[model samples]
Each structure stands twice: as C-alpha cells, then as structure tokens.
Target: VPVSPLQRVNFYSAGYRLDGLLYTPRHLPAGERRPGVVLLVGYTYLKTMVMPDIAKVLNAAGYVALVFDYRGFGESEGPRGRLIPLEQVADARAALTFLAEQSMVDPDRLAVIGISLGGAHAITTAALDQRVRAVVALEPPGHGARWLRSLRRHWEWRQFLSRLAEDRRQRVLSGGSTMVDPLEIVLPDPESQAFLDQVAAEFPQMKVTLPLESAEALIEYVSEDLAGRIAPRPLLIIHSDADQLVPVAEAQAIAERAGSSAQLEIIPGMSHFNWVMPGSPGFTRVTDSIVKFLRNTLPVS
Candidate 1:
C-alpha cells in the first residue's frame, strides 16, 4: 500500500461518464510525469472484478494505472448489461485519453493491458490509436465471431444463431433489444463451472445477462485485422495452454498476425480464470510476465 496510492475518478467516454480508479506510485513529487497503463477487464466484468491487484502492482512498478468499468457493466453510464464491441473500444481509447491528460502521467508512454474480450478491445484500440505505446493481451480471441461460435456445440451454435436471428427481428418490431444470458450459449462444464463459481463468490452482484445485440456486434468485430498495424509498439500476448474458455490457438493466431515487435507467452498449466485468481500460481506467473513486459516496453526514466 505504501508503494501505490489510489483515487476514484470519472471521465466521459462517448458522452457517458465512465467510472475509474487511478493508481499511482506513492510519495511522488508534484508534476512529475510518469508512464501509465489502462487496464481493461474481461467479458461482463467490472473494473473491481479483476484488475485491482494488477493496477496496484503496476503502480508499485512506477507506472500510473487506470482501471475502469466499461459502459453498461459497472458504475459506468449505459444501459445495464450490454457489451457493444465498438463502444467498448471507444471507451478504452477514452480511458487512454483521460490518462494522457493527467498532470502526473506521461502521454507518450501510455499502454493498455486487458484480458479475454477486453484483450481484443486492447489490441483493436492500440492498433487504431497510436497513443497506445504498448499492449498486453491475455487469452484474447482474434475474432469475436469465432469466439462466440467456439463456445457452442454444432447444434448449440445453430440454436444460438437462430435465437440471434429472432432477436434481430424482435428488435425491429419492438424497437428494443432482447436479453440473453451468457450461460444459455455455453453451459459451463464442471471445471468451467468451478471457475464461474469462484468469480461469483468474489463478486456476487456481477451481471450475468447481456443484450443479444452484444453478440451481434461482437460477431463482426475482428481484432486480428488490426494486429499487424501495432508496429514499432511492443505487443505481448499471453495464453494458458489449459485455457478452456479461449483456446490457445487464438493467442497463436494473434501473435502470428501481429507486428515484429509482438511476443507470445504460453503458460503450461493455467486456465482462463486462473490468470486472474490471486491464490493461483498462474496469477503470480502472469503478473510477473506483465510487470516485466511493462518495465521493458514502458520503462521508468
């Protein structure tokens, strides 16, 4: 706690006030600009759900860290429980813009780190915004559509598509969005169920349902198309070989498509959720890799 200081803040993202927490190294002199990072959470997760420890660690490593709730997920302004891909990307860029303007942050050294869906957002945002000097994506899916399809069995995928079609029709007729619970698309196996239970135990109030348009929008969002554009800027992709939610192949595809500066790290025994669990050794490994990558890519002067 002595190494990092925290502040609650809010900033506008596409006209809506998004809630965030800014973490900085403690006892720094006034007006001294420092490297900064924006941490984006996984699918349907809040800022408080996963990244607080990572932000603190980043702050302790002499970088300013900002973690925020995407619109519609946490305290941020939006229709509750929606995850529009482009809107989230816009929010990520907005967060970077907010961090850059902070008196204590170095604009040129800003980076982004994200997990799962947020990882895809980070890659896409960093590719488009030259302002993001570096990026780290853990267990990221290269294509959002593929990610959704991969979650289902052949029949299940077909059924979901059917539902998606109906949702679109209902939207046009009712002038409103249809709701879909994530679990309805992919029923968790015992192991995956345990992962969900663990996270649920931590944040019991987390949103479990999302608007069907969320999946519709995601289906068209492809981050791999932008991967190679993140040039000269360092990129790090990490995925666990044992990950069940996002296949390791997604990370491989992303790294293969990214610029020369990109590096991929595969952790042998970690699951998708283990990377974020404080008690898991996988967390230690992932965090250590992240800290090291940030130190090298966005070094303190």
Candidate 2:
C-alpha cells in the first residue's frame, strides 16, 4: 500500500532550531496511532542522505519515523556543519520528547535507530534517558579504545601534533595562541580514506567541520560504557566482521558486556557502511534482524 504524505516540524533546541521529518503511515485509519522510531545519524554525517532508505523501511514497518538534524548540521540552526556530540544527543532527547506527545504517535512504543557515530549517540542517549524503549546501534565505534589506539599510533600522534602546531601558529598570528587544532580533526584510516575518497568523488556537497576542541579535548565524551547503562531495554549490535574502521573486537566487547540485553550480529564480509548497500546479504541480514526485533518489541498497528 502507498503511504500518506509525510509531515515535517521545526523545533528549537538550546540556541538552535531543528527541522524534524515525520513519516506517518497512510494505512493507519483516522484516530489511529502507531509506534515511533527516532532516527539518529552520526556526528560526522548529516541526516539527509545517510539514512533516508532506512527511515522509509522503518515507516513501512508500521513505525512513525522521525529524522532530525542536530544543531549546526543538516539544515538545522547554530554553526553550520558542526559535529558536537553532546549537543546532538540533547537534540535527540528533544526529538524523543516531541515525538512522545504527537497525536499520531504512541508514546509507549518509542525506539531509536542510529547509524555509525549516530549509533553511539543513540546508545548513549538511551542510556541517559529512561524514555527510550529500544535501541539499534549499527557499527557504533567503541570510542575509548579507539581513542587510545589512535593516540598510541606514532603516525597519528605526529599528524595530531603537526596539525596542532599549525593551528597554534595561526592562532598566534590571530593573537589567540591558545587555539588548538580545529573544530573537528580528520583522522584517516584506510577505511575512512575510502569513505573520504568516495565523498570527494561522488558527494562533494557534504561539509566536514572542525572546532578547536578537537586538539584541546580528549575524546572522552562518547562512552563505551553505554553498553552497561542501557539496562533492561533491548539493544541490537550489528557489525561487519571485515570492518576496518571500528574493530570487530569492540563490537564483540559491547555485546559481551551488554549480556542478554543485547543481540550481536556479525556479518561475514560487511564493512562499516555496507549495511546501506541494497540487495546485499549483509543488508538483508540487518533488516531482517531489525524487523524481527521491532515486531517482537514494538506495537505494530
């Protein structure tokens, strides 16, 4: 069956205004309400192109899919194209709150599905807020370990310090010598390089922002401990075995620590972004797991 026209709403957060897209199933009769799924995208990527198909699938699965950009990214207010995880998480909470009160959405059946870095945010936000009922973390990197490893790599440290010195020189020239790297640091692994090359080749419009905070602050904000704090609620951990960006061990640790509350799905050759590649076996496996989980946990009208 065809779906109805989706609606979009604008709401304010801290100092920024965000536009959130809502897809309500047309199949629902008047006065009928359905469960809602809050779509969270990672910090590095915007909400626009990363998860549209996934959102559509969720809507088709009887969910009112809500997708919104965080402040400074993806058509939202604040600094343009910034990757502030904390602020993004706040926006997610706000999105959840707004969705819960909507007439066409059932407050009890709220879930969050996030991809990549957005996946980490989803788990963190859900752990912090008691309102979320279910969570799907697709290839969420274990930040603590990754940061440690990144810092230990001599090449990475050299790159960081070199960038740090350049930034400092510029800051000194501007009379603010205290300035560090930039808003966001672009650290490249082979996997990330492939992603970047793809973006440069195909999607040039995507902007990456860097705040001075990158060199000044340690990557302590995003926690791997979210696996534990996310108690009682079900969490789905989907990772590709061959993913080089985020090690499979991290995903395994998350699932192992997450215990019975989490379900870990390891795909044979799927990479970090491979979940989005349509018709692939890994893609099918992910969707099947998601649909099965949604059917079991959320109310379908």
Candidate 3:
C-alpha cells in the first residue's frame, strides 16, 4: 500500500499564515473519512525538520497527518525567533481546524501529537480546545519551571533567573523580545545536543537561535496541572528513561496527574530525541504505541 506524497498546505492562524505538509493515504475512497492528526515539533524546531516521519507513520496507519510550522518558524509567517508557547498552542488548535476542513478527514476524530515543547503545546491545546479527541505528548516537560531549572545547576538557575529579570526590564524599555540562542534557555543534554548536531548536519535550517523572553514563558508553562483537563480524552504520554533533558520524572508526574485516561509508556534506555529517528527501535516503539492508541481511541473506517 503506497502512500500519497506530502501535499503542500497553507492556513491562517491568529493573524498569521502557517505552512504545512499534509499526508494522506493513497487512493482514499471517495466519501470515506479518516482520523486526522497534527504533529508539533520541539522547541525552536521547524515542522519540516522533526514531524515528517511521524506524519508518514500516521498516514500509513490510515490517518491524515499534518506537519506545520508554528507562527514564527520555518516558512510560516510570524516574527522570527519569538517562541511564545501560548501562540504555538493557538497554532496547534488552528491546525486542527484546517485538518478538519479537509474532505478526507473526519473533523470529529482530530488529534494533536507533539514532541518536546510541542508536546507541551499539545497538552495545552487539547485542554483548551475540545476539538482534539486525543493527544500524544512525547518527551514533554511536565513542569516547565522544574524542567528549565533541571537543565542548569542551582547557581546557574539563579543566574539565569537574574538574566531573565534583566531581559524583562529591557523588554519593557525596548518593547521587544531579544533574540538569543535557544540552547542558552533550554540547554540540551549531551545526547540531545548530539542528535541535534546530527540533524543540523543535513537540515541546516534546524540550526536556529531564538528569543530570551521565551525562557520565562517556558518556565511559567506548568502543564502537569493541565493534563487532567484533557481527560477522559485519550492522552498517550511517551518518554525516554534515559532522556537527560526532560528527565523521566517529568513524564512520570504527568502520568500520575493525568490518572486513568493517560497511558504512560517509558521506554528503557532510549533518549528523547530519537523518537523521530525512523528505523530505530525507539521510533518503532513510539509508532506502535501511537497507532495502537489511536486505533482504540480515534478509529477510522
């Protein structure tokens, strides 16, 4: 069963246009509708970089898949380097509407699947909008403050707080967000950065730096409390036991709070970033969990 080529798509969200690639099962029957999913990528990531593999998997699983840039990244329209989590959540919700409008997609069966920070946005979007029937969060930060602080030492966390304070004052003075290397805010662990280096080698646009004020927004994003809001809608929480960046505890806390509606899958020894790596066991495990969950939750004809 061959799949359809990823189709170029454009949609409007929050006064900005988004660029997306829509994946469809080949030769979908007329008048037949399928479950649709919007895949959201990690922090400062272009949709072109991280989502195609997963989107293809979902498409192969008899679903419509969409991978898109948030307002400010890649080919999407927005102020570059301004990484606002709320705005990204809004974009995810808007992506759902666009997916819903597709003739091949059952608007009632839409889901949002996000990785890393996009994972966090998935939770927020699902919680805020009931249009999302299911959600999958891969290696997302359960508590933003804790996750950001964990990336730095206590002293460094203090210094980073001070720096954010200064940036806040400067933002008031300048009325703008200052651009900063994304790593400075969400410092990646060894394997995380290593995998990013691997991606940047081929996808050079993945080599992007972003805003400083976003660090504060990132820290204030406590989605652990919001997880419960997504129930009894299906939520699949997948994380890596060896995920140095988000820490296994973050995923644990999300599952603990989400209660029975959430299915938590902790893959032993897998790193966070490799979930997107096709042909890898971790990717297979993730894909299996997602397909199985969706089959049970948002089933198609």
Candidate 4:
C-alpha cells in the first residue's frame, strides 16, 4: 500500500557517507512539500532491519519517511561494528540536514521516530536540535545505567563491569580494542530470542561481538535529563506495560519530567519487540498513534 517505490539515498554525517532509504508519498504535485520523518533503529541494528514496514505505511499516509543506517553500521561508511551514542546523535542530526534539503520536504515540519535504544537517541536529538519539530520514542530507556543494570543480577553485573575494566586495561596495554559477545550486553529471553534469531538469520554479517567501548558508551549516556528539553515541542513516548527488557517505569519517569506537551502511552499485553513486529497486537495501535500525532501537529498536506 505504499504510495511510491522506495528511493535509495546517501548523505554525509561527520564527513562519512551514510546510506538511507527515502520513502516519498506518490503524487505530491510539481512543487509541493510534505512533512519528513527520520526513522532510527535499536542498538547496532541496520536501517533495512528496522522499521521499513512503518516507513511504507507512513509514505502511504502522505509523509516522506527516511530510514537510514548510522555511520558505522549497514552500508554506511565508517568503522564497522562500533556503536557510539554521541556519534549516533551526530548522525541523526546529519540525517535531519539531508531531509531538510530535499525539495519535496518542508524543512520546518520534520520529526523523528526512534525505537528501543534509538528511542533514547531520538529524544536526545530533538532536545538538542530545533529542526526536529516532533519526536516519537518507543520503549526508550530513561537512564542507560539503570537499564544496563536491570539486564542482570548483582553477580552478573559485577562480572560484566569487571570484564569492562579489564577490556579498558588491555586496550591501554595493547593499542587495540577487545571485542565482547553482544549477548553479554543483552541476555535474550524466549520472546526476544525468537526475534533476534530471525535477525541473525537474515543478516549473516550482523555483529556477534562488539567493541568494549559500546557498553561503556551506553552506561555513560542517559536520556532522562534530556526528556524535559523537548518541551514547547510536542513529544510522544510509547511503551508496553508488559515490556520485560525495559521497565515501563522508564516511560513514566520521562513523561513525568517532560511537562505538559509530552504524552505517554503505556499499552497492555505487548512486549518490547511488538512495536517493531509487523501485525503484532499493539503495532497497529502504535502506528495509529504516531500517524495521528504527526497529522495533528505538522502541516498534513
């Protein structure tokens, strides 16, 4: 039901060329404009792997949706397998710049849709960049440290930190970085395991081990402080009440601090991955909320 065929595009972020897919609605006339949205995926996930279905739906609804890879991931040009939070913030800003330049897009009517860890990135980017007129954060973590700590018990957390310290020490000793298994960062349950298995099966080159710095970057980055900054600009934070990976309280804290303009939706009976899964119980509801929010806020040509 997409309005037009997907257009493959590339743009620069921190001088590195990043690849992206631009979804332009069909029949916008000769010189008309429509609102633009940048779709960001979860941790270390590629553009093709995340949110393509939603992008298609948004395109059909008359919005130009952009789904792109961060500098180091997917087809983008950068060091491979590295996941840096601040670096991603810079990349999202660069994507906004690129979307603004397209003739069919209204620069002032731009928004961001970020899922999982990318949700945190979206909120942070919107807070720092006025160019992002609205933000949709799905299952975002309020505090990176808390989220990381919640993944494991006391012993496991201690062991992980110890390994992190050793990795740092070895890096200083030997002029290189050590790679840790991605499973060490996120221990998947049955539900998450099924989704992750599909992803791994689809993308063979998808990283199994990540640089030690990726964990460090996540522990040091927190988005709760930035949530309030999105004020005066509308923000939508969506999460499932039964989300096992990220506690629903994360969304509550963000909403409590985000002031009057921010609206939080906590749906029942949906898990963390359900938001991205096509035809999942809450997927339609989430997408509808997003479409309605953007339509009400932006110029809905």
Candidate 5:
C-alpha cells in the first residue's frame, strides 16, 4: 500500500470525462518508452473492476497499462447507466490516443486487452484504429446476436426479443430507455453469478444496472466481421470451454475469421470468472499466454 505505482488520470471520450488508472513500472530506464495497453472491462463494470489486476501485472511485465470506466458507467461522465457497445468502442479509440500520446509510452507499440464485452470492443476498436499494434480478447463474444441467443433457450430468446422490441418502442415514446438489472439481458451462468457474488462485497459498484436499449444495440455489433481486418497486426483470442457466460465457439469463430493473424487458445476447465481474477490459477496461466503473445507482437522494449 506504500507508494503505489498506480496513477489516477482522466481523458475525454465523446465529450465525457473518463476516469482511469495508469500503471507504470518503477525505476524505468531514463527517457525510455515502453509498450502501452488500454484495458477494458466487461458489461456494466467500473474501472475498479477486475481490469486493474491486469494493469498491475502488465506493469510488472514492463508495460504501461490504462483502465477506465466507459462513458456512462462508474465515475465517467455520461447518462449514468447506459452500456451501448459502440459508444464504448468510441471510448476505446479515445483511450488508445490518450495512451499513445503519453511521454513514457511508445506510440507505435500500443495494444488492447479486454474481457467479455470489452473483449469484443478490443477487436472492434483495433479494427478501426491503426494505432493498435496487437489485440488480446479474453472470454469475448464474436457475434452479439449469437451470444445472446446462445445464452437463452429458444422460448427464452423469443421472449427476450419481444422484450427488446418493447424497449425500443418505449424509447421512442418516452425519450428514455427501459431500466433493468444488467442480468435481465445478458444472463450469467451459475459460475458467473457466484463470481459476481464473491466480488460484490469488495466492489459494490458492480451492482449497477444498465439501460435495456444497450442490449438491442449489441445485437448488430458483431466483432468477428471486423476481426480479419486486424491482420498484419496480431490478435490473440482466448476462451475456456467452461466459460458458460460466453460459449468457447465465440473464440473459434473469430479466430477462423481472423485468418492467420489470430492465435486461438482454449482452456477446457476454467470458467468465465477464473480468466480474470487477479491471482487465481487460471488468471496466471492466461496471463502467460498474453505475455507470450505480446512478446512476439508488441515487446515492451
């Protein structure tokens, strides 16, 4: 707790002041630039969520890491609880620029690492921004519609779609979106729920609900379609079969579509939560894959 390497900072994304934490290695070479990364969180998560754990580990690996709350979540300025995927993508791009322009970071050696919905955005933001040298997506969904459908039974999917339609009508008539618990849309599996409960006490901000319109926007926001464009640069897609929150097929689908530029790694035993928890066995193992990918694609030096 003494003299932490974490630096609290701010940047603007589409007119919103985003709150972020930047982590840098200590006792660095004088005037030397290191690779920088923009870290992203899952749905409805705050900047203080699991992402900062990755930032700390990245710092140990000699990379500068930045993690921030998306425009409408946490301390970031916005409409309070909106979780639109494309809007987050806009914020991702802005974050990349902010990280790239930092004096201690090498603009040419920037990468993005994200988990879940963030993982999807990592692929998308990198697809549109040439500034990204490498991409890492953990437990990400390649297709938004497929992800939502897969999480529900046939009848449930139909009901959810009906609800979405109603939410859209409500939006046009009321000049506002329907509000619900984040779980009402992206249904979490038991493991994810248990993980949520475990982390809830330490991070009460995770309990925030989101706008229903956010889910409708996600249905058309497919990341795999753009995954191939990240080629010539590198992309690492990691998903575990046990990650019931998002099927492992999501990783396979994106990797196949990404051509040879993508490296797909699968863990058959780890669930969605294990992949992101700070010091858990799965988290450590996955970090190895990420560091290896970065060493080959975006070396800190």
Candidate 6:
C-alpha cells in the first residue's frame, strides 16, 4: 500500500457514487495540466486490476488518467455482476464529466480507452458525447455479426425454445405458468466459455444468471451499431485474431464503419480476454499505440 503520486478518490456519477483511482503524473503539479484520459475496463474487471498499467503509462507520459468501475460491475456503487449497458454507459459519461470538473484535467483533451463491452460503449457514446476527442477500443464487440446472436440470447430468445416445457409446468399448476425460464438464449462458443470461466475465477460473484426481466433490458444494449455516426473522432481499434468470443471481423467492421478516422491493429494469436492490460497478448505495442494516438489528440504541456 505505498502511496504513489496517483490519488484515489470517489465521485458521484449517474445517480450513484463511483470509486475511481486517478493517476497524476509525477511532473504535473496539483493545478497545472493538460487533457484527461478515462480508462473503461471490460466486464467483471475491477478498476484496480483491469487496466491500471495503462493508466500509469498515461500518467508517466504527461496525461492525467482516471479508471473506474461500470455501474453494475466492479467496486462502483450499483448492482453487482449485472450487465446494465445503458446505466454503465451513462456512468461512463458521468465519469467524463467528473474528469472535466477536475482542476488538473483539461476538459477539451478528454478521451476514452475502453476494453470489450466498454469499447462498444466508447464507440456509441463518442457518437453523441461531444467531450470525447479520441477513442481506443480494445477488442470491442458491438459491430460484429455474432453480437446479433448474443442479443437474441440476452433478450430471452432461448426461453422461446423452452416454451413447451413452460406450458407443461403451467398445466401442472392450478394457474397458467407465466413464470418464465431464467435462461436467456446465449450462443455456444468455446471461447465464450473460456472467457466467462476466466472472469468467474477472477470475480466469483459474476457467474449467476440474472432474472428474465433484467435480461430483457440487457438485450437492448448488448448489440449496438458503431459506424459512421462517430465520424471525425480518431478511433484506434485493436483485436486479437485468435479470439473466438468476438471475431476480428467485428473490429474490422467497426473500423470500416468509422471510415478514415479509424485505425485497426490486429494482434496475432491472442484471445478475447488477452487484449486487456493484465491479460495475455499484453502487448506493450497496443498501449504504445494508444499513447501515441492520445498524445496527438491531447495537449501535453
């Protein structure tokens, strides 16, 4: 528990207070500074472990770095282990606002660095959020073809398959069995299994199935369209070719939609989870690319 120059603080965001760790570079004094970069981590990842290294890198390179948990995930004050994408994205927006409010952080130089689901929100949010100058999406998932399938599952399409069983249960009861199956129609991908398994191992509370009603809401934001709408903002997308849960084509599609403003980097032989800072493929080149992009977008001195 050594106290580095990084200041850990809590801020209120989207109706709930969020715990965030801010890494201020050694050189930057209390008040004088440049742009701020917000680091958004993937599902089941705590802000401390998920992408701390990236934040530290930014801090060392002369930019203030902020990392926080999404609304329903990590240490933030909200429902834990639930995939409430809308709420979480709103939290991301709120985080940006909080960053802007900071004396050390330059509002105009604000940018977002997202991983997996966070990446998708960065894409969708950048389209409407004028505050974001540059976005780095690491293995983002919204634009892929497989995402549509995930939406169906998260939306309870799989429950439709078990309707007959539901009917049978209703017949046995004195009243109609309106009780729906808890299972949403999740597609089968070994990579998905491995990824979830890894997440569960890291965060034990994350493996539970959500209620059908909650699942319905989650489905709405699970699949998003991220293309042309976020035009002009520089987008850097990095994906692992060996990823099974989210294909490389998905990232490519997002880059294509982003048009000339997007930059795509494919890391050979890395998995979906590996793209995150602490994970495998832990490519320094990936972080380096992000630094270069953000530096160009934000003022350093």
Top candidate by lDDT: 5
For model 6, residues 115-147, the per-residue Cα lDDT tens digits are 876788787778768899888888787633355
Each candidate: what lDDT? 0.85, 0.72, 0.86, 0.85, 0.86, 0.69
Runs with alpha carbons beyond 4 Å of true place in candidate 5: 1-4
RMSD of 1: 2.1
User: How well does model 3 score by local distance difference test?
Assistant: 0.86
Lowest summed lDDT across 10 adjacent residues in model 1 is found at: 180-189
TM-score of 6: 0.79
**Backbone clash pairs in model 1 (N, Cα, C under 3 Å; residues 3+ apart or in different chains), count:** 0
Alpha-carbon deviation at 74 in model 6, angstroms: 2.8
Instruction: Give a tens-digit lDDT track for model 5, residues 212-277.
Output: 888898888899999998968889888877778889999899988899978888876678776566
Provide the lowest-lDDT 10-residue window in model 4: 1-10
Q: List the residue pairs that clash in candidate 1.
A: none
- The parts of candidate 1 lying over 4 Å away from their true place are 1-4
Pairs with backbone N, CA or C atoms under 3 Å apart (clashes), candidate 5: none
Candidate 1 lDDT for residue 90: 94
Per-residue CA lDDT of model 2 for 1-301, tens digit only, reads 3435487688778967898788886667776778888989864566665566777777677778888878876678887654567777899999998889878788988999888667778888888988889988887766643543552478766666666577657766774433222223535566667766785566555555555543333255544776788888999988876776667776777787677988888778687666666567767677778878888888694
Residue pairs with clashing backbones, model 6: 153-185
Error of 1 at 260 (Å): 2.2
